[PDB]
Design an enzyme around this catalytic site. Structure first.
Site, short mmCIF file in Angstrom:
data_model
loop_
_atom_site.label_atom_id
_atom_site.label_comp_id
_atom_site.label_asym_id
_atom_site.label_seq_id
_atom_site.Cartn_x
_atom_site.Cartn_y
_atom_site.Cartn_z
N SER A 140 61.54 31.14 -36.50
CA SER A 140 62.87 30.85 -36.85
C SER A 140 63.56 31.86 -36.41
CB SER A 140 63.26 30.16 -38.13
OG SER A 140 62.83 30.99 -39.02
N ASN A 228 58.41 18.80 -35.67
CA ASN A 228 57.43 19.52 -35.00
C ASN A 228 56.55 18.81 -34.05
OD1 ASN A 228 58.59 21.57 -36.63
ND2 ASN A 228 56.88 21.38 -38.37
N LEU A 252 53.15 28.76 -15.13
CA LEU A 252 54.06 29.13 -15.83
C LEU A 252 55.01 30.37 -15.32
CD1 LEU A 252 56.57 28.62 -18.01
CD2 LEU A 252 55.01 29.96 -19.74
N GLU A 254 54.77 31.68 -12.25
CA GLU A 254 55.70 31.42 -11.14
C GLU A 254 57.14 30.84 -11.43
OE1 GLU A 254 52.99 30.42 -7.67
OE2 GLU A 254 54.70 28.91 -7.53
N1 LIG Z 1 61.94 22.51 -36.60
C1 LIG Z 1 61.74 23.23 -37.70
N2 LIG Z 1 62.34 24.10 -38.47
C2 LIG Z 1 61.92 24.86 -39.47
C3 LIG Z 1 60.61 24.29 -40.38
N3 LIG Z 1 60.61 25.03 -41.33
C4 LIG Z 1 61.72 25.82 -41.48
N4 LIG Z 1 62.64 25.79 -40.48
C5 LIG Z 1 63.74 26.21 -40.25
O1 LIG Z 1 63.90 27.61 -40.35
C6 LIG Z 1 65.08 28.25 -40.81
C7 LIG Z 1 64.39 28.86 -42.22
O2 LIG Z 1 63.35 29.81 -41.81
P1 LIG Z 1 61.80 29.68 -42.36
O3 LIG Z 1 60.79 29.70 -41.15
O4 LIG Z 1 61.69 28.60 -43.50
O5 LIG Z 1 61.84 31.01 -43.04
P2 LIG Z 1 60.76 32.08 -43.21
O6 LIG Z 1 60.48 32.46 -41.65
O7 LIG Z 1 59.58 31.60 -43.86
O8 LIG Z 1 61.73 33.44 -44.04
P3 LIG Z 1 61.61 33.58 -45.36
O9 LIG Z 1 60.93 32.30 -46.33
O10 LIG Z 1 63.04 34.05 -45.93
O11 LIG Z 1 60.63 34.54 -46.02
C8 LIG Z 1 65.83 26.97 -41.23
O12 LIG Z 1 66.67 26.93 -39.80
C9 LIG Z 1 65.02 25.72 -41.37
O13 LIG Z 1 65.49 24.74 -40.92
C10 LIG Z 1 59.82 23.54 -39.44
O14 LIG Z 1 58.58 23.22 -39.90
N5 LIG Z 1 60.31 23.07 -38.23
MG LIG Z 2 50.93 31.14 -3.82
#
Ligand SMILES: Nc1nc2c(ncn2[C@@H]2O[C@H](COP(=O)(O)OP(=O)(O)OP(=O)(O)O)[C@@H](O)[C@H]2O)c(=O)[nH]1
Ligand SMILES: [Mg+2]
Ligand SMILES: COc1cc([C@@H]2c3cc4c(cc3[C@H](Sc3nnc[nH]3)[C@@H]3COC(=O)[C@H]23)OCO4)cc(OC)c1OC
Ligand SMILES: COc1cc([C@@H]2c3cc4c(cc3[C@H](Sc3nnc[nH]3)[C@@H]3COC(=O)[C@H]23)OCO4)cc(OC)c1OC
Ligand SMILES: Nc1nc2c(ncn2[C@@H]2O[C@H](COP(=O)(O)OP(=O)(O)O)[C@@H](O)[C@H]2O)c(=O)[nH]1
Ligand SMILES: [Ca+2]
Ligand SMILES: [Mg+2]
Ligand code: NA
Ligand code: NA
Lengths: 440, 51, 423
Positions: A140, A228, A252, A254
């Site tokens: 993210s 997801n 990919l 290319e």
């Molecule tokens: N599409 C999608 N977005 C996610 C998912 N989980 C978290 N997010 C998004 O990711 C962002 C938050 O980051 P996270 O990945 O949860 O946080 P982290 O990387 O674990 O960071 P910290 O918890 O602060 O250590 C927000 O925009 C959430 O909506 C997921 O499973 N799918």
């Molecule tokens: Mg070729």
């Protein structure tokens, strides 16, 4: 030969990784214990799916993947989940204290405690490769770990692997799906820091995916599992050329030649079709022309922006399933007479086509309908800068008051890093303007 | 013999031109090496300084 | 007078393997290398392209920076026939990048190739020179192929270098960087080849779509045309007769000025086969010279023929061939230059290709070929004025200066061809 190592960072990257590797196994006929009965070469081989899976002498097919998070509870669900036996315990790395939604803690305070271990595990995977091609990094923009630890990891990967290619799948924040208030800060900081270290980055706007689930799958409030699964289908479309081969398959790498005209202009816009419920797919077969047409409809973009209001510098169509070039060419001929497809004047206007014959799959009991053919379009359009503009504006609102900046200064950062990151984004936005201007 | 010597002069010019091509080939690849290494060194130093 | 054949990159090895399938058939060599033919013209000059338990082995070297396409050749119909030690390949690939083929990836592999070249050249009673198949739009055939040509020249400066060079077209394109790779390669060819057959993918596509009415042409369709052309254009090198040609006589007679050595081939009848009506000699001559039959997308009526060599194959009236050949010049004298007398020559070979009772093939040194280099130059310039996609090349050590010099040299080439269209 041609192995790709996947790295899943923070909650978003890890949970998307769950979805992706589950889908890969279903596409390849790999069971949850890693056995692959169709694979007659025990313990090795050079098959297309070996770019993503290594093999043990006991017949297990093991993802070339590392899962990393600074808290344990999301990876623990992998450790105990359906596919626990897929992974060696050493591929799943956790700390004890997360980054508290704070880039500074993910990049510095907490991240620096675990980066050496993470790199040592990645090195262990790389050493099993006969011809490592590069890395796919899932994360993210908004979380403390997804932003801050990912930038640290990318910087270190450039040191340890030179200019070996690194691709990102980056989750762009949307208020609908939960989101810390400081996510615009984390996003700009990580985008600035990773920019020189990434060769190509597929942004995925959580609001786009949310809308597609609500509108096309008729789900009132999509969960992370809903989002997801859809995201994994796009990832699967994009990596399918690495994992399968066939006469019409186009690698990919290319497409990447066409998609990246300048190092910094490396953010393709993805669009996917078709996304349809079981109820609607029953007694409806979507043709090649139909799905192709759907790629040019803005509602099916991975990122919210308006390509009609920018210019194209590349357009790539990645087809899978029952698709022959004759039907593709006709569909494209039709599209080019009915759509606003304006290219920059310094680049050719052809569409680059690849076809992977293995049909798409879906997770049993999910919401996506199983279809006979699908397409992912990758274009490079100056319109994707609208996504940066939106994020830069939220940054500016907060930054002009220094709201929440003390949480980053408290962790050792300086305001200088904020303005330098923001200036880099401003130059990025100006880069997208300049490349769209007609030549003298 | 004067015609033979003229053929020899022209071959020698040729091999000298091709020798200049080989050294340019050498300069290109050592330039790529130098720039990859300077990228790695720069990144390593900035990381160390910021940490 | 042995020829050493080299095929490099994906296109190179695909049209290369088709060339060997076609002529192996014409000489009566089966996939296992044993001769089972019914005539003795077949074996008389067989050693030009084959080495000799009374089995025949193509004097062919197969080169690529990734193992894919050469796994396909080794699994193909005639794959058994190539000498296994003459497969020379790497693992990295060239990423459709001239710089990688010419300066980084290709540089690593080129000495291995020259060892195989050297060994083939040593078993030669009298080496005529080299024939290379490749495209100019990719990375291995284009970048590594021209690097090979340069290294070969340096080691065999008194031998002939001949290429079949596939020119890229937006109508049949793999990547946007093709004009860059092709412009860098043409520069190499202007300097280091004695004869280059320009095989233009735009012309092949047009021919497949309009004439052969194949609406979805594959590389297989394009390669059917190239295969037929390569056979016809090499006929007088491989078969005994009236006129026994070779690579050096080809160049002395077709190249009046050293840089203008880029030829437009032409072929008749054009086929995708499916027809049993054999053509009259008038029809062969008419079609062969028709623009719709030439493998380079150039209008000969926009330029002039400096030299022309034609070969008719099958059984037919020598007297009628001479009459029709003389007819075409005496009816369009404006498209042949005045200052090269008797610049159209005609040969005949009794042995037709496969599936055809008679055919005609045409080798032309025409000033209209400047249109092909203009087209490429325009496409090159459209990107290069914005430096688009250049980082793929500067990342390998190249400087912009090298692109500027290649652009300049190719525009010079276009100018030189125009100089003699107005002579
Ligand atoms: N599409 C999608 N977005 C996610 C998912 N989980 C978290 N997010 C998004 O990711 C962002 C938050 O980051 P996270 O990945 O949860 O946080 P982290 O990387 O674990 O960071 P910290 O918890 O602060 O250590 C927000 O925009 C959430 O909506 C997921 O499973 N799918
Ligand atoms: Mg070729
Ligand atoms: C412990 O109590 C709560 C705290 C927050 C609070 C919290 C509080 C907030 C806020 C954001 C956020 C963030 S939300 C986030 N979602 N993904 C990443 N970050 C985070 C998350 O966890 C949190 O604890 C943060 O904006 C204004 O007030 C929120 C709450 O409910 C909404 C809870 O109410 C009791
Ligand atoms: C490679 O195949 C051919 C080559 C030539 C070619 C060749 C090509 C020419 C040309 C002359 C000539 C001469 S012809 C000659 N006959 N006696 C002495 N020299 C010579 C001979 O050996 C050659 O190689 C020369 O004028 C314009 O183009 C000619 C061909 O047919 C006419 C062949 O097929 C088209
Ligand atoms: N006529 C023909 N052209 C080809 C073929 N394969 C590739 N090409 C063309 O060759 C160029 C790409 O080069 P390619 O040989 O694939 O790259 P390389 O392997 O690095 O040498 C493009 O212009 C393609 O259109 C083929 O089999 N036949
Ligand atoms: Ca229905
Ligand atoms: Mg977390
Ligand atoms: Na196996
Ligand atoms: Na190498």
């Amino acid at each position: 030969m041609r192995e790709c190592i996947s790295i899943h960072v923070g909650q978003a990257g890890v949970q998307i990784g769950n979805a992706c590797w589950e889908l890969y196994c279903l596409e390849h006929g790999i069971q949850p214990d890693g056995q692959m009965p169709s694979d007659k070469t025990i313990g090795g081989g050079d098959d297309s799916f070996n770019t993503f899976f290594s093999e043990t002498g006991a017949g297990k097919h093991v993802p070339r993947a590392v899962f990393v998070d600074l808290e344990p509870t999301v990876i623990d669900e992998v450790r105990t989940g359906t596919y626990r036996q897929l992974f060696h315990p050493e591929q799943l790395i956790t700390g004890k204290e997360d980054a508290a939604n704070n880039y500074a803690r993910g990049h510095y305070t907490i991240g620096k405690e675990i980066i050496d271990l993470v790199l040592d595990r990645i090195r262990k995977l790389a050493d099993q490769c006969t011809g490592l091609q590069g890395f796919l990094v899932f994360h993210s923009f908004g979380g403390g770990t997804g932003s801050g630890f990912t930038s640290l990891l990318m910087e270190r990967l450039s040191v340890d692997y030179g200019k070996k290619s690194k691709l990102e799948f980056s989750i762009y924040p949307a208020p609908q799906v939960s989101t810390a208030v400081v996510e615009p800060y984390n996003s700009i900081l990580t985008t600035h820091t990773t920019l020189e270290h990434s060769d190509c980055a597929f942004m995925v706007d959580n609001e786009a995916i949310y809308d597609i689930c609500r509108r096309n799958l008729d789900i009132e409030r999509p969960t992370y599992t809903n989002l997801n699964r859809l995201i994994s289908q796009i990832v699967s479309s994009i990596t399918a050329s690495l994992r399968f081969d066939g006469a019409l398959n186009v690698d990919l790498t290319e497409f990447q030649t066409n998609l990246v005209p300048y190092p910094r202009i490396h953010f393709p816009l993805a669009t996917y079709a078709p996304v349809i419920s079981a109820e609607k797919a029953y007694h409806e077969q979507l043709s090649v022309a139909e799905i192709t047409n759907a790629c040019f409809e803005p509602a099916n973009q991975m990122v919210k922006c308006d390509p009609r209001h920018g210019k194209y510098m590349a357009c790539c169509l990645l087809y899978r399933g029952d698709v022959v070039p004759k039907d593709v060419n006709a569909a494209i001929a039709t599209i080019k007479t009915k759509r606003s497809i304006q290219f920059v004047d310094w680049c050719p206007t052809g569409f680059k086509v690849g076809i992977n014959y293995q049909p798409p799959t879906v997770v049993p009991g999910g919401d996506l309908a199983k279809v006979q053919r699908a397409v992912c379009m990758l274009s490079n359009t100056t319109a994707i800068a609208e996504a940066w503009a939106r994020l830069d504006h939220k940054f500016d609102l907060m930054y002009a008051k220094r709201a929440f900046v003390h949480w980053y200064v408290g962790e050792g950062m300086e305001e200088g890093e904020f303005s330098e990151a923001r200036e880099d984004m401003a130059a990025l936005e100006k880069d997208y303007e300049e490349v769209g201007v007609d030549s003298v | 013999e004067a015609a033979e010597e003229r053929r020899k002069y022209q071959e020698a010019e040729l091999l000298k031109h091709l020798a200049e091509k080989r050294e340019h080939e050498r300069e290109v690849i050592q330039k790529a090496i130098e720039e990859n290494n300077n990228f790695i060194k720069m990144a390593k130093e900035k990381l160390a300084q910021k940490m | 007078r042995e020829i050493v054949h080299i095929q490099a990159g994906q296109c190179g090895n695909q049209i290369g393997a088709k060339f060997w399938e076609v002529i192996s058939d014409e000489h009566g060599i089966d996939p296992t290398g044993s001769y089972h033919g019914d005539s003795d013209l077949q074996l008389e000059r067989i050693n030009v392209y084959y080495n000799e338990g009374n089995k025949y082995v193509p004097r062919a070297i197969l080169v690529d920076l990734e193992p894919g396409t050469m796994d396909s050749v080794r699994s193909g119909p005639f794959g058994q026939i190539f000498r296994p030690d003459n497969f020379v390949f790497g693992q990295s690939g060239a990423g459709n990048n001239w710089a990688k083929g010419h300066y980084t990836e290709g540089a690593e592999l080129v000495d291995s190739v020259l060892d195989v070249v050297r060994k083939e050249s040593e078993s030669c009673d009298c080496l005529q020179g080299f024939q290379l198949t490749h495209s100019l739009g990719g990375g291995t055939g284009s970048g590594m192929g021209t690097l090979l040509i340069s290294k070969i020249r340096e080691e065999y400066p008194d031998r002939i270098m001949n290429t079949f060079s596939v020119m890229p077209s937006p109508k049949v394109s793999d990547t946007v960087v093709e004009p860059y790779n092709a412009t860098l390669s043409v520069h190499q060819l202007v300097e280091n080849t004695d004869e280059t057959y320009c095989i233009d993918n735009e012309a092949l596509y047009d021919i497949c779509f309009r004439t052969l009415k194949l609406t979805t042409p594959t590389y297989g369709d394009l390669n059917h045309l190239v295969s037929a052309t390569m056979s016809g254009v090499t006929t007088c090198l491989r078969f005994p007769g009236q006129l026994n040609a070779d690579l050096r006589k080809l160049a002395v007679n077709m190249v009046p000025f050293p840089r203008l050595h880029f030829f437009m081939p032409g072929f008749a009848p054009l086929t995708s086969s499916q027809q049993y009506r054999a053509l009259t000699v008038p029809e062969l001559t008419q079609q062969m010279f028709d623009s719709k039959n030439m493998m380079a997308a150039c209008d000969p009526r926009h330029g002039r023929y400096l030299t022309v060599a034609a070969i008719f194959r099958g059984r037919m009236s020598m007297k009628e061939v001479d009459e029709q050949m003389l007819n075409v010049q005496n009816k369009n004298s404006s498209y042949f230059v005045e200052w090269i007398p008797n610049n159209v020559k005609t040969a005949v070979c009794d042995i037709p290709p496969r599936g055809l009772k008679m055919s005609a093939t045409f080798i032309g040194n025409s000033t209209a070929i400047q249109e092909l280099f203009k087209r490429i130059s325009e496409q090159f310039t459209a990107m290069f004025r914005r430096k688009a996609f250049l980082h793929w090349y500067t990342g390998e050590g190249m400087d912009e200066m090298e692109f500027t010099e290649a652009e300049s040299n190719m525009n010079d080439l276009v100018s030189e061809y125009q100089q003699y269209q107005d002579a």
